[PDB]
Amino acid sequence: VFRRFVEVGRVAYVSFGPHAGKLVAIVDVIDQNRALVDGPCTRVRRQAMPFKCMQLTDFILKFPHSARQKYVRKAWEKADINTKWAATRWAKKIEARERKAKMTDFDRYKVMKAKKMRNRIIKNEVKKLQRAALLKAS
Amino acid sequence: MKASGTLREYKVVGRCLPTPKCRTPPLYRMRIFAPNHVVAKSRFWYFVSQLKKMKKSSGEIVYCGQVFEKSPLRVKNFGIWLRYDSRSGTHNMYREYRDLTTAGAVTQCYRDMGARHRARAHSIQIMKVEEIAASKCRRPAVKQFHDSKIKFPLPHRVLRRQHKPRFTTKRPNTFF
Amino acid sequence: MKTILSNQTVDIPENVDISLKGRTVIVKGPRGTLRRDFNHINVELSLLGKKKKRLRVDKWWGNRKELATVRTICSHVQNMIKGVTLGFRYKMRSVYAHFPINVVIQENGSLVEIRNFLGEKYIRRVRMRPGVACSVSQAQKDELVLEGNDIELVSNSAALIQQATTVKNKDIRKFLDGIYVSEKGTVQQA
Amino acid sequence: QVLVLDGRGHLLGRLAAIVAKQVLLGRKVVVVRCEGINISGNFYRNKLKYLAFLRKRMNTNPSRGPYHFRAPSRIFWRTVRGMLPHKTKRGQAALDRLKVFDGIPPPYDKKKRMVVPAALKVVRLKPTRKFAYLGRLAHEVGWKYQAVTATLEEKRKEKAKIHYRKKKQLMRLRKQAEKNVEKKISKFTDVLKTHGLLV
RNA sequence: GAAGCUACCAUCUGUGGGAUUAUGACUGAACGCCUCUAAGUCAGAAUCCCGCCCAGGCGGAACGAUACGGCAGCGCCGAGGAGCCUCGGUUGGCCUCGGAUAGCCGGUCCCCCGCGGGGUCCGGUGCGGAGAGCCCUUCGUCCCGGGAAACGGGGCGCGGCCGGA
RNA sequence: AUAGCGACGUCGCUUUUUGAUCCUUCGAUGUCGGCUCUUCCUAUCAUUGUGAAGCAGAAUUCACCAAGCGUUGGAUUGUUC
RNA sequence: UAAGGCGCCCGAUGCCGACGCUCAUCAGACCCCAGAAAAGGUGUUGGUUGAUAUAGACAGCAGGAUGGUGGCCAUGGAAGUCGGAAUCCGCUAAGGAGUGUGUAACAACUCACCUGCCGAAUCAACUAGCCCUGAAAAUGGAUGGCGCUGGAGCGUCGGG
RNA sequence: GGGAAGGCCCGGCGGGGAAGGUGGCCCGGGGGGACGCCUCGCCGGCGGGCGCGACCCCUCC
Ligand SMILES: [Mg+2]
Ligand SMILES: [Mg+2]
Ligand SMILES: [Mg+2]
Ligand SMILES: [Mg+2]
Ligand SMILES: [Mg+2]
Ligand SMILES: [Mg+2]
Ligand SMILES: [Mg+2]
Ligand SMILES: [Mg+2]
Ligand SMILES: [Mg+2]
């Protein structure tokens, strides 16, 4: 079954191309594999864009199929897409990936040191729990 | 013509040189879809030589300039009247496309002609390009996009960038 | 040209229930259960509407070549529903000129033996498909009845025992002998 | 350091080209479960192609002529050989770095097998097209070990299911322990979260 | 005329399956009906492939015995002892479900069958139970303190029990 | 008209007939037949499985998958024929 | 850089290349060049022209499908159905001196045409792309090979 | 083309138009939420049901 459709007013996340990594709102469907979109608030000038480079999110905001950027921005601000996107888990994973990429060598060493303890404690406690479960089974 | 890249629309006006017979020959204007102004002028001379008794040696390009799209943010339906050469005989046709720019629609027309009839740019003679209302559209491939509540999914997304993780332990997912 | 959407819906009666796991459908009713998968069609099946009222088939972005599969899926599902609620009864008759065709049923309707087909010393032995029951019709001189729930299985058995009796090296326009499907109805009528 | 590939779902030539390049580049490659490989085009077409290959033999002495290997592993091996300069020492040394197998042998069943998305059927073929199974093609061309390898694969699958269940149980213990000890491993977690290894 | 060779000039023996071609069909759309075809399915042969049969790979397997009694040569072990010559490449490991893709993955008692398999429900889903990942992480030693551990670490240090074709 | 044929036309295929040419060979590639022996082609005479007849049966036509297996013994002639 | 190329052989697309077309049980794949035509396809994709359809079509399922008259010349027999011209009228919602099957002739069936149910698009005739039929030779065999079908094929194109 | 669009002032404001018709209205159904018909749950209570007839009584999507 399909849950994410392409209609007027859906928010999609651009994966690659000029505006890579930005949200956008679908205004119209030009053709089978091209849509007229704009990110009035995410800094993306109104333009055409292929379907091959956007990934659909589960955010819908209402405006007519050819409304101008004024009304598109009005609907975007009214629905407050930015904070909800920042709060969703998708953006959290993206932001964490960006953090890991940005990490320099000193924080790499610090992360190694912290992970050593984290794994050691977890492994010891897991051994304790496994022994306890075995004793309970016996 | 070599339909290189995306075409551009040029307004080209030309006239015969003044002669003792007539001081001021009438100026003739034409719309040329071309990669650049040089080939635009060449096509203008070709068409005007077919139409009138005019040649480049006995004429002059009074003006030649690109005409920009009037509304490049409104998706429009374009009807194109076209004249092309097959392997046996020549035919007139009318085709509709859907795009934001007249030049983009004409480029789509050239690519579609090459794909469907193996006709080449030196065979296609473009005649008329008009904005056509959705009620006046008559090709179903364009008409099916005329509704307020358009809605369709992307069913089978094929994995691109197949080579960046050239060896990956997942079998990729095609349902998003 | 690829159509944006082609859909068709099927209404199911109250006495039968339908459960689908992806593209395989299971139909359960008074006469039993029928299962059929459709992983070779690649369209969308939805059991929309509480009270299991309807089953909808969707196809997005399909040319005319695969747009035909929607109605064939719906027809297959309707046939499964019909065979589950009512069942399928294929009645066939044996036509002969001189030699009577002696048909005897064994394995409680699973094997059919045919003898004396045009003075034949050879004995035809045809096995029914699983879930198809053969019988000799009462109140009729010579006629076979095939009972089943799967229309494909019943009709395949009928075709098997029809093609088992064909004249060889003779004018088939004159030697009109063999068992032929007289009619295709249901076990019980509406 | 050896690249272990799984054949199931991969296309013959598409996988063979990548394997040949990797082998030429010096890497040791072992491809496993070759009978799961599939080829585009319908089964009758592919069987006809293999029969046409079978028909090619030296007229005067077939014993010296082309050798038509029937096992799927050897079929894949030969089509890889077709993409290497096997007449030279470099090509032969490369070809010696490749190992093919039907099923999954004991040296490799207890290992993680890699996957090549650039040669996968689900990626390279639209669903409406027809494909053929190399295992079935080989079996009805004259491979004699389709059933034995099937039973052995069934045994391997039923053992791997037990191993995977044990892995699931052990990890679930791991997660329960993690949420149990979050109290005293919290100060070790915010650093990973700030550097984006745990969010 | 022995023996031996030897003759349709004597006598004996000569095989079974599978996918399918042509063709005939089932269900069934496209195209309200129809249709062997488009998706799916069936029967099908001196053909094809294999079996039976002949050979047996710079291809493997199991098993037996493995060099005196004056010398001796050998096999296994002593985490057995120093070395000498020669051939090189390498410069951290990942010890594993099956598989789908017009769908998947993980928990669950709230139920049903034989710990496993189903049902409901709850979570994730551009895969944070991720290979775009995980694990180990090495300058060394000496004092005192805090955090984790007291069940842990190390032992051809041990004797057994299972685990594998 | 089209079971089976097919006029007046017109489009092809083959190199098992003959031509046309003269590229190789004249410090030589032994130049007709028959005998013997193997393999290959299909444009299928028979046999296996089929479809169509102006196919009642018998016989016989036309067509399809198809070269697996067979295709003889003699008079006359150096003959191929 | 030219010409030519960039899946592997084999240097170069390991571009998140663009738009389409095409399934071949003989696919196709680059000047010279190394193999094919006339004629066809309800395979599929475009295009041209003309029709009829809420005064309710196209299917499909059902009812009618009449008198003069078995029209005239005819043949042994021709009632419509082998033959020669014409083809009228009243009844009609409609019926042709007849579209076909059938008998020696009838008979009978059936069609043109009109009605009932069903309720929105449906018919043709051409034309051009790819694919398919046409398409048969001898040692086993050659888009250079492997192989390729979200193309590594065909057409138009872009960066590198 | 002294850039073509575009952005911001509800820019104000002049009139006009249909449609890929927003509300509104009419018809139809998929519904539900008040759950108004049974069944359990604790004669009064709330929660359990993953309850069960509704029907223009509305009433929302
Ligand atoms: Mg006969
Ligand atoms: Mg068989
Ligand atoms: Mg068939
Ligand atoms: Mg079969
Ligand atoms: Mg070193
Ligand atoms: Mg010689
Ligand atoms: Mg000599
Ligand atoms: Mg032949
Ligand atoms: Mg090259």
Side-chain angles (χ1 to χ4, degrees), chain C residues 89-190:
Chain C
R89 171 208 304 281
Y90 271 41
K91 292 211 280 186
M92 35 199 318
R93 305 189 47 82
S94 73
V95 171
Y96 56 69
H98 186 273
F99 304 99
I101 291 175
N102 297 322
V103 47
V104 50
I105 326 292
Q106 336 165 330
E107 280 65 338
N108 53 67
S110 292
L111 193 68
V112 172
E113 250 152 11
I114 307 162
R115 318 161 178 268
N116 208 31
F117 173 67
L118 318 192
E120 192 82 13
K121 302 237 301 182
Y122 175 59
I123 303 166
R124 266 103 182 170
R125 206 168 269 93
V126 185
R127 167 146 278 110
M128 311 277 75
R129 289 305 160 101
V132 176
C134 199
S135 61
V136 167
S137 176
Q138 312 323 60
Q140 194 54 257
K141 207 310 163 193
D142 60 25
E143 151 167 17
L144 270 75
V145 174
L146 307 188
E147 298 310 43
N149 297 337
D150 198 311
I151 180 190
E152 266 182 40
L153 295 181
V154 173
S155 56
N156 201 6
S157 302
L160 265 171
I161 82 174
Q162 170 176 356
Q163 275 192 330
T165 77
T166 69
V167 190
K168 300 284 188 190
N169 301 113
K170 284 187 174 44
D171 216 277
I172 62 171
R173 305 173 302 150
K174 186 167 194 67
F175 290 78
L176 306 161
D177 315 69
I179 312 166
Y180 308 92
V181 175
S182 69
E183 69 69 356
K184 319 165 186 176
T186 49
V187 182
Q188 81 210 39
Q189 291 42 33

Side-chain angles (χ1 to χ4, degrees), chain C residues 31-32 57 71-72 82 85 118 120 156 169-170:
Chain C
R31 289 177 48 86
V57 185
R71 183 167 169 172
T72 205
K82 166 192 254 195
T85 80
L118 318 192
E120 192 82 13
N156 201 6
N169 301 113
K170 284 187 174 44

